[PDB]
Backbone:
């Protein structure tokens, strides 16, 4: 459930 | 962290999240000890029984975080690893003795209100604070229950336990490089680290100079927050000669 | 030299919600 990182 | 509470903003600015690149997931906790060195447990990076053997490019370190899953734009810093150093006498076969590893970052991280290094203890620090009954603090984004994930960093304060009690609670051989902490069944209070929190810091605030010191590393336990069981931690001061050697050489 | 002093707490003389529990245990 991790938001995507740059 | 089981039976803990939400951390306050900037409460543990040395907290580091070890993040697996693929699949994306929380790998372990860790701590910032300088602008380019991060401390964690050896078992977070190397544990043959479970075919765990990470290399520098398998992960990232995320510093300055509060929310577990969100990308904290303008707050957190993401860093890549230059090199991993695992204690050469880490005993993964028997009892996780010397469960410690260092990670050197590719570039120095800038400090901020949310990112700041913790101190490492010297012999006097250890002697003064590492006493049964004295409480330290454990933080992490790990499970909230043994068998359930937090929205934000959790914190719990736990008392160091007498060595005989620690020894009598487990069949595992305990060494001088470990200490245990947690409440006893008759104390009422609860709390423990859990899956996802290992490698994170156990810190104490010196009442002499008002500075936070990392006295332990979340190393192992049997279950999480079970009555009559305690969390075991790597004794940081006992391994400081190795830490210094690595940083002095590389 | 500044290790262990939190910008949002010690540096500005503010205490967190539970640090007193730790101090009280250092008897
Ligand atoms: N305080 C706790 N309840 C606790 C702390 C750390 C762990 C760790 C660590 C742990 O307890 N064991 C099991 C283990 C214990 C003793 C050992 C051992 C393995 O090999 C030799 O001696 C591991 O593997 C690590 C594993 C990595 C993560 O998933 C979480 N888990 C579990 C519970
Ligand atoms: Ca025993
Ligand atoms: Na327990």
Residues:
């Amino acid at each position: 459930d991790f938001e995507e990182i740059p | 962290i089981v039976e803990g509470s939400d951390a306050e903003i900037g409460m543990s600015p040395w907290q580091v999240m070890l993040f697996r690149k693929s699949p994306q997931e929380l790998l372990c906790g860790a701590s910032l000890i300088s602008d380019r060195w991060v401390l964690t447990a050896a078992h977070c990076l190397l544990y043959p029984p479970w075919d765990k053997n990470f290399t520098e490019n398998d992960l990232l370190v995320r510093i300055g975080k509060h929310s577990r899953t969100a990308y904290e734009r303008n707050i957190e810093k993401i860093s890549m690893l230059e090199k991993i150093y695992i204690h050469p006498r880490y005993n993964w076969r028997e009892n996780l003795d010397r469960d410690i590893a260092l990670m050197k970052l590719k570039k120095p991280v800038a400090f901020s209100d949310y990112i700041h290094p913790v101190c490492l203890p010297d012999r006097e620090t250890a002697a003064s604070l590492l006493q049964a009954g004295y409480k330290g603090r454990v933080t992490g984004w790990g499970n909230l229950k043994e068998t359930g994930q937090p929205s934000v960093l959790q914190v719990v304060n736990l008392p160091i336990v007498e060595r005989p009690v620690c020894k009598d609670s487990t069949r595992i051989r305990i060494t001088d490089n470990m200490f245990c902490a947690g409440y006893k069944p008759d104390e009422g209070k609860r709390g423990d680290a859990c899956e996802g929190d290992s490698g994170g810091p156990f810190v104490m605030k010196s009442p002499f100079n008002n500075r936070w010191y990392q006295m332990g590393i979340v190393s192992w336990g049997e279950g999480c927050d079970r009555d009559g069981k305690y969390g075991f931690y790597t004794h940081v001061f006992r391994l400081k000669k190795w830490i210094q050697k690595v940083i002095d050489q590389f | 030299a500044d290790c262990g002093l939190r910008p949002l707490f010690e540096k500005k003389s503010l205490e967190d919600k539970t640090e007193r529990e730790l101090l009280e245990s250092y008897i």
Notes: The first helix of chain C runs from residue 19 to 25.
